[PDB]
RNA sequence: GAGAAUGUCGGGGAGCCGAGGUUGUGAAUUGCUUUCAAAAAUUUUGAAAAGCAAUUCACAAUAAGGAUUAUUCCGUUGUGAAAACAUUCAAGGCGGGGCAACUCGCCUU
């Protein structure tokens, strides 16, 4: 921060694909599975 | 000026529910008034009936009304003479959801 800025409200936060983030955090809490189960199709199915 | 994304503040419409209140029916108790109808000294006491109620409980209706048997409803909104409308509105197919009814998406006319 001491040397740059990013053209946007310097104290504002912007959504960055929160959906898959939540799905992934909760699908990581589940454990006892491979770290590849969350694919695009499975993500869409969970969201639906 | 237009659009897309992200926040803030407001506005509108629709929907699933809840608690009273009011009026009326019945009951428990206590009253006011009138009349009967006795007893007693125009006045006092007692039974019955009617009017008006109070406190509490169960129940019925809650815009007059009109449908219907679906676990459905229309009745205080706007336009305007057509007493006619708006506020529901096609067809398929490929899927998700469930105990299933039913609910949420995708594809082409």
Q: Which residues contact A39 (CB under 8 A, 6 or more apart)?
A: none
A48 touches strand B (CB under 7 A): yes
Measured to protein CB atoms, the chain B nucleotides within 7 Å are: 5-7, 95-96, 104-105
Angle of the A18-29 helix axis to the A40-47 helix axis, nearest 10: 100
Structure determination method: cryo-EM
Q: How far apart are CA A32 and CA A48, in angstroms?
A: 24
State the number of CA atoms in the 13 A half-sphere of A8 facing the CB: 5
Nucleotide closest in space to A48 (CA vs C1'): B96
Per the structure block, which two tokens stand in for A17?
């694909």
Q: How far apart are CA A45 and CA A48, in angstroms?
A: 5
- Tell me which long-range contacts A34-37 makes (C-beta under 8 A, separation of at least 24): none
DSSP alpha helices (H): ranges in A1-48? 18-29, 40-47
């Amino acid at each position: 921060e001491k040397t740059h800025r990013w053209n946007f409200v310097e104290d504002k936060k912007y959504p960055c694909n929160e959906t898959k983030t939540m799905i992934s955090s909760r699908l990581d809490k589940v454990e006892n599975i491979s770290d590849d189960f969350l694919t695009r199709d499975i993500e869409q199915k969970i969201w639906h």
